[PDB]
Ligand binder design. Sequence first.
Ligand SMILES: [Ca+2]
Ligand SMILES: [Ca+2]
Ligand SMILES: [Ca+2]
Ligand SMILES: [Ca+2]
Length: 147
Amino acid sequence: MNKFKKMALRVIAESLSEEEIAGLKEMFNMIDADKSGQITFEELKAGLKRVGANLKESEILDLMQAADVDNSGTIDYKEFIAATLHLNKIEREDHLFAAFTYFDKDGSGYITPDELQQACEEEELMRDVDQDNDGRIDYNEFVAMMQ
Ligand SMILES: [Ca+2]
Ligand SMILES: [Ca+2]
Ligand SMILES: [Ca+2]
Ligand SMILES: [Ca+2]
């Protein structure tokens, strides 16, 4: 069974599109705030909410411990991807994150008006979408727009 389960997880991972992969990479980088290549518990607690999940602290610790299979005390990129496949709340958003990272041309984590204009080669916009008035659209505001 566990074998079959592992086989299914591999199918899912292999079935991710390259655009979904780029989205997951942006998610990872968003959480890995110091760009160290490794996500710590502190980063995970600060960052999960930004990628649309915001679990309870105890739930985040459970995720951290399950994902950290080499007991590094950190989540690396490969561990992160594997983990998203075990958390519906996150993996269900892979397509939305693919779309967000497409608009977020510079991988800044926020869509700016200039990026909006770049995309429209494809600004009442900002008023209804930018809910916190920082002049940028973050992932959560993007999801809310999509609804
Ligand atoms: Ca880090
Ligand atoms: Ca690890
Ligand atoms: Ca940006
Ligand atoms: Ca904003």
